[PDB]
PDB file of C-alpha atoms and ligand atoms in Angstrom:
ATOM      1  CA  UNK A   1       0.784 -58.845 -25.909  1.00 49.57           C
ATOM      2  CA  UNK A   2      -1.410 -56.015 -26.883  1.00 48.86           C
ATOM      3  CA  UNK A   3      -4.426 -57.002 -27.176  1.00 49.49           C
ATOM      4  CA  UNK A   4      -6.468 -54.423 -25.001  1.00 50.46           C
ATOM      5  CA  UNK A   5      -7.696 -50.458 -24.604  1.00 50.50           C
ATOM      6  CA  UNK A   6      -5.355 -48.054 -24.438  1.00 48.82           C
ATOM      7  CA  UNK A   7      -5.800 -44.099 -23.964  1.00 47.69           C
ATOM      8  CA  UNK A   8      -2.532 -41.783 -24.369  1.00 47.72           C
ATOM      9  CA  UNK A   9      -1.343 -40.414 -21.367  1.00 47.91           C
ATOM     10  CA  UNK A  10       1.972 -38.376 -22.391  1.00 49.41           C
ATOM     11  CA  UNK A  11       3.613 -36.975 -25.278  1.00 51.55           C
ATOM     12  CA  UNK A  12       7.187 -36.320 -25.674  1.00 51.32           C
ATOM     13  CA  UNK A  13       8.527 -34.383 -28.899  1.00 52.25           C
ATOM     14  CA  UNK A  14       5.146 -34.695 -30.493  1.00 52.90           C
ATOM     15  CA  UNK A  15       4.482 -31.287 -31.685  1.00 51.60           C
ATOM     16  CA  UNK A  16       7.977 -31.370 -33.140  1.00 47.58           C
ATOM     17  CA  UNK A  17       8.010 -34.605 -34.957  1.00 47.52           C
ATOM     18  CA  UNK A  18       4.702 -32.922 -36.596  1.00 48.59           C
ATOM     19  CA  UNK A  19       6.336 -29.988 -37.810  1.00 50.41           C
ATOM     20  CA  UNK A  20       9.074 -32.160 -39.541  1.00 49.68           C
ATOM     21  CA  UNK A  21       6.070 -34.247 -41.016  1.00 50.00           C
ATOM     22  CA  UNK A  22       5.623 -30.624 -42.409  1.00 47.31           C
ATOM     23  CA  UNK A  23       2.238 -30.596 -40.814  1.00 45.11           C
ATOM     24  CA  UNK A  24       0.369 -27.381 -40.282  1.00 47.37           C
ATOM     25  CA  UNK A  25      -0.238 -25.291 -37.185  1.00 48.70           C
ATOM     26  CA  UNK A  26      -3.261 -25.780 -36.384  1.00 50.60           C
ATOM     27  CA  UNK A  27      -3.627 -29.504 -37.212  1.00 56.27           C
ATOM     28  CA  UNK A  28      -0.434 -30.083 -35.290  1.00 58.25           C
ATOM     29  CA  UNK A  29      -2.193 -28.583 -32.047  1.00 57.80           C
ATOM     30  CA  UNK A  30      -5.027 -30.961 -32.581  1.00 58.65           C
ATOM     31  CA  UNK A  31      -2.903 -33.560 -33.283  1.00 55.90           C
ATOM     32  CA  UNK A  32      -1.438 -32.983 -29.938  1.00 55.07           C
ATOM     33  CA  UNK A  33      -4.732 -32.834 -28.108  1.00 55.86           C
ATOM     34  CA  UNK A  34      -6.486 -35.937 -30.203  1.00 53.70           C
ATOM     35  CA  UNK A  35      -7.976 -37.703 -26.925  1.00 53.94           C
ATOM     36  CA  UNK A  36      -6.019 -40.807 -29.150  1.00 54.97           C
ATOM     37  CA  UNK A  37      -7.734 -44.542 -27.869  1.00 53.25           C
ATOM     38  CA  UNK A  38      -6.738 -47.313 -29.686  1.00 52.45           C
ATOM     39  CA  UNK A  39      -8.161 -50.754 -29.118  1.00 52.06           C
ATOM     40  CA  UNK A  40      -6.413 -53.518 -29.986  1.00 51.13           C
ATOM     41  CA  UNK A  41      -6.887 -57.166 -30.563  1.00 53.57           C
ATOM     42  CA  UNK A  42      -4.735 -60.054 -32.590  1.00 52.37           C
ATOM     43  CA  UNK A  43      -5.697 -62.962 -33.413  1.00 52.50           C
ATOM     44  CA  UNK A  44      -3.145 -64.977 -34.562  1.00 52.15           C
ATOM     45  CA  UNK A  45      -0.890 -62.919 -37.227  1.00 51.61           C
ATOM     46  CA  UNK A  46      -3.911 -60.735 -37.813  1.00 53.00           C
ATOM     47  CA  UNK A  47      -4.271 -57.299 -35.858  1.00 54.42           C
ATOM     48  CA  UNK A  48      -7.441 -55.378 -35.443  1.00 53.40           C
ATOM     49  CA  UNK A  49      -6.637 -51.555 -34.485  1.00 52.65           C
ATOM     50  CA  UNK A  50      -9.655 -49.448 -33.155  1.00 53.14           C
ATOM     51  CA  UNK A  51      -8.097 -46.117 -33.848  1.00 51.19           C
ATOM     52  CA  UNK A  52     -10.571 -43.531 -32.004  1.00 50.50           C
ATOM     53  CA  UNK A  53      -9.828 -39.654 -31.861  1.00 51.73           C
ATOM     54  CA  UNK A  54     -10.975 -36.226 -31.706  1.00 49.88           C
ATOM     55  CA  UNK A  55     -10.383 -36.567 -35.740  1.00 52.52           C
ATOM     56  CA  UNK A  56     -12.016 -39.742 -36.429  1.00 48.36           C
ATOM     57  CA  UNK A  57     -13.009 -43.341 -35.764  1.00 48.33           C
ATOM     58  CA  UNK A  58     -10.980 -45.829 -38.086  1.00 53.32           C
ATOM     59  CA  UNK A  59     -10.608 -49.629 -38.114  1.00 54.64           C
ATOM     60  CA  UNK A  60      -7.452 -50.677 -39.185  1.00 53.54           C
ATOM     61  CA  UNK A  61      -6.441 -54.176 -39.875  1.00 53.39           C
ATOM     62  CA  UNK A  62      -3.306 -55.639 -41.113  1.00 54.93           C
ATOM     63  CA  UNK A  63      -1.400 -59.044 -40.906  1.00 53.34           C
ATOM     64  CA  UNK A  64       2.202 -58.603 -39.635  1.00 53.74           C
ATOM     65  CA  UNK A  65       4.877 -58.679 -42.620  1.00 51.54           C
ATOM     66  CA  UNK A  66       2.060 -58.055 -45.185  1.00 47.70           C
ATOM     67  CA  UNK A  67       2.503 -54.612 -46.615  1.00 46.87           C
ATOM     68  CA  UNK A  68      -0.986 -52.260 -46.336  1.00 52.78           C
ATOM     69  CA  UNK A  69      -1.959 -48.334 -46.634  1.00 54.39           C
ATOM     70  CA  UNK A  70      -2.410 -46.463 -44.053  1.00 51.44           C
ATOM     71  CA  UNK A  71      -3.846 -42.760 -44.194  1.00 54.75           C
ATOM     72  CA  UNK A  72      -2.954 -40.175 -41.330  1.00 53.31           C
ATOM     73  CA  UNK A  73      -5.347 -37.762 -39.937  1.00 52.18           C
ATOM     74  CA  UNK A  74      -4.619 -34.711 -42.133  1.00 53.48           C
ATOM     75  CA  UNK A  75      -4.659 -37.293 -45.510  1.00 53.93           C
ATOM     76  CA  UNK A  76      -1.082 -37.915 -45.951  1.00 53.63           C
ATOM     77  CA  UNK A  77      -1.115 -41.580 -47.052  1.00 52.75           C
ATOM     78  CA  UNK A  78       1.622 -44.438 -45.853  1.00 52.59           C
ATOM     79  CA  UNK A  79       2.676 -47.931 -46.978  1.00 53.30           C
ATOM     80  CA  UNK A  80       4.625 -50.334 -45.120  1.00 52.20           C
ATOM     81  CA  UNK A  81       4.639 -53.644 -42.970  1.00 51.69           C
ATOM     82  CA  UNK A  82       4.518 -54.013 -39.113  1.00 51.05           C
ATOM     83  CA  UNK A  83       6.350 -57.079 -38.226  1.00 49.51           C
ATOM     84  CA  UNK A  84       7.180 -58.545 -34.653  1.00 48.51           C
ATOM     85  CA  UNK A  85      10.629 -58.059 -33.081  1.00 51.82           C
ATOM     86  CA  UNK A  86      10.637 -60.322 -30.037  1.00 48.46           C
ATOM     87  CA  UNK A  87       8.190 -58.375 -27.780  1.00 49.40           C
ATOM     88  CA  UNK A  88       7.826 -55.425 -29.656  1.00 50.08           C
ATOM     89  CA  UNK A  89       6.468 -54.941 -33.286  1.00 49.44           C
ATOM     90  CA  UNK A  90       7.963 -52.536 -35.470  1.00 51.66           C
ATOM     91  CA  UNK A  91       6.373 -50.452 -38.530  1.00 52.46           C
ATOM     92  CA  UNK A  92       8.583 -49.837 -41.418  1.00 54.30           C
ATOM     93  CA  UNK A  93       6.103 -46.982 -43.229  1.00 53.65           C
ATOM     94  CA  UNK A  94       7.090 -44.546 -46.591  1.00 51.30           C
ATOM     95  CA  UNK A  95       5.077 -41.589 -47.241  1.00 52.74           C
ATOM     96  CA  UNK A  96       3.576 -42.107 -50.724  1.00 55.78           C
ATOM     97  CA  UNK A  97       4.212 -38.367 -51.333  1.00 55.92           C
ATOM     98  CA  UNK A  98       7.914 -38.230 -51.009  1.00 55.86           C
ATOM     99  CA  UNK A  99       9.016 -41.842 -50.233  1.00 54.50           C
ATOM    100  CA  UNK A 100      10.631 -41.041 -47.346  1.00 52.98           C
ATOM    101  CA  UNK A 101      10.813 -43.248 -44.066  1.00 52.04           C
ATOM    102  CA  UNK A 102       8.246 -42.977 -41.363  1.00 49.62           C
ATOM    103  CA  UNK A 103       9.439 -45.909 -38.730  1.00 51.95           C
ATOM    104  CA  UNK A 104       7.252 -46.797 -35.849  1.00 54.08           C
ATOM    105  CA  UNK A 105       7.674 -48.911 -32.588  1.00 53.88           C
ATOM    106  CA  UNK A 106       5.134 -50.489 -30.070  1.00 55.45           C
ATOM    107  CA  UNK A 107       6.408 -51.855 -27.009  1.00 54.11           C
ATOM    108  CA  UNK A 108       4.545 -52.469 -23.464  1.00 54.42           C
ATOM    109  CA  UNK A 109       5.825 -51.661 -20.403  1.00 57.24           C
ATOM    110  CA  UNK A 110       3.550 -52.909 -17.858  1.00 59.84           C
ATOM    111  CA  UNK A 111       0.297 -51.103 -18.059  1.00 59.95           C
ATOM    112  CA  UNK A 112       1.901 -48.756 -20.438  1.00 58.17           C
ATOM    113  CA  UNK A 113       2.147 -49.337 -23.969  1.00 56.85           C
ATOM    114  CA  UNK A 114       4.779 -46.903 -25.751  1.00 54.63           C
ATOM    115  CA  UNK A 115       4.757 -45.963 -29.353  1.00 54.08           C
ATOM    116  CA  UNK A 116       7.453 -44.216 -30.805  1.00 56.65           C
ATOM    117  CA  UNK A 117       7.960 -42.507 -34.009  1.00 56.62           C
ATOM    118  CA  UNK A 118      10.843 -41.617 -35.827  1.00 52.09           C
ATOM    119  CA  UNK A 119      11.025 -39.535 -39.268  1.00 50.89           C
ATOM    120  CA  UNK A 120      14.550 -37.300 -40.540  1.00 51.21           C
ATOM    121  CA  UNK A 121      16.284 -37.405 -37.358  1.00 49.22           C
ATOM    122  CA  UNK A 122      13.352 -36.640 -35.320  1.00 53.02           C
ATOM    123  CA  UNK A 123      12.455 -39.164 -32.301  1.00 53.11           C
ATOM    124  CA  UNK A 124       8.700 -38.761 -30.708  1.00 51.36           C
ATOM    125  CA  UNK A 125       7.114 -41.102 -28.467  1.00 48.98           C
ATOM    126  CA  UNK A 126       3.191 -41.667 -27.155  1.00 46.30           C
ATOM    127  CA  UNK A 127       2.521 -43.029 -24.019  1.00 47.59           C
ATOM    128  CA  UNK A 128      -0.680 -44.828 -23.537  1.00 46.16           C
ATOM    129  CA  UNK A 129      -2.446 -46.614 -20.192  1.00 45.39           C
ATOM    130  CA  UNK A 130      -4.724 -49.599 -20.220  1.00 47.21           C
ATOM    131  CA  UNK A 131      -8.208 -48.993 -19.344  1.00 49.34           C
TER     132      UNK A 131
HETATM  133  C1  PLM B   1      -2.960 -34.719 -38.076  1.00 48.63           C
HETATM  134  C2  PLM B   1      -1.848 -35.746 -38.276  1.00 48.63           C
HETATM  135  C3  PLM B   1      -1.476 -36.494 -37.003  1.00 48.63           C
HETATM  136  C4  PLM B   1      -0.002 -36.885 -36.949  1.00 48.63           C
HETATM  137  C5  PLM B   1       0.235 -38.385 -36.833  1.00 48.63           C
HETATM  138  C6  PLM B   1       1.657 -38.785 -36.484  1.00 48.63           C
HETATM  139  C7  PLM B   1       2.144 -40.045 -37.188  1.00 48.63           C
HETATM  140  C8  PLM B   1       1.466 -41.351 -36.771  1.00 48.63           C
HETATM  141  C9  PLM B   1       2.061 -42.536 -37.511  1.00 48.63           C
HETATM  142  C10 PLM B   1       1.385 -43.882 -37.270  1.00 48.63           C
HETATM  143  C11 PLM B   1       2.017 -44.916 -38.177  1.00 48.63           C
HETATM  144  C12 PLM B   1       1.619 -46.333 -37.830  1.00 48.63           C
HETATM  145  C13 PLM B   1       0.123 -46.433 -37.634  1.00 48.63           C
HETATM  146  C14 PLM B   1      -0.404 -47.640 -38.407  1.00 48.63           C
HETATM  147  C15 PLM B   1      -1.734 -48.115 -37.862  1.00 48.63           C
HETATM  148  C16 PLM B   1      -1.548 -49.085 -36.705  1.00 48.63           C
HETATM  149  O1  PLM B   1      -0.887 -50.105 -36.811  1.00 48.63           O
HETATM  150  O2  PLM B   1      -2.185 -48.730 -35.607  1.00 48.63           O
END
């Protein structure tokens, strides 16, 4: 379901769900303007993630409901699973630094793909279009 390549488009509540990530000025304007592409491509229970950005160009792989690391742009390292929901697959993350709860949620709606992240009461969402 979302298998494909996929360049953000919007950004709502970004900058402020980076400041409760307690991340710092000038990485959070960055953050904001990252150019984010991700390409992505399962194959069978096993994801491949092209994560390309302004900061850097990362594979990722994972299996869904087997627990991996994941390290952010500015270094702050994450654990957790992403498992499928029905038609969306949800990330269940903890920051290895305080061990609190990072949750994240991909979903498509059609030709858009929408991620959205949650962390202490703050809601942000990415909105991505296929190429
Ligand atoms: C400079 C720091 C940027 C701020 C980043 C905001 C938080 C992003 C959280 C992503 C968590 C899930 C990503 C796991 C990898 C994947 O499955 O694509």
């Amino acid at each position: 379901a979302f298998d494909g390549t996929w360049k953000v488009d919007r950004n709502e509540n970004y900058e402020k769900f980076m400041e409760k990530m307690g991340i710092n000025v000038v990485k959070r304007k960055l953050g904001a303007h990252d150019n984010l592409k991700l390409t992505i491509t399962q194959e069978g229970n096993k994801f491949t993630v092209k994560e390309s950005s302004n900061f850097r160009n990362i594979d990722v792989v994972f299996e869904l409901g087997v627990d991996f690391a994941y390290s952010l742009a500015d270094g702050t390292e994450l654990t957790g699973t992403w498992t499928m929901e029905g038609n969306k697959l949800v990330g269940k993350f903890k920051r290895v630094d305080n061990g609190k709860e990072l949750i994240a949620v991909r979903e498509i709606s059609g030709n858009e793909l929408i991620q959205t992240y949650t962390y202490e009461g703050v809601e942000a969402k990415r909105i991505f279009k296929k190429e």
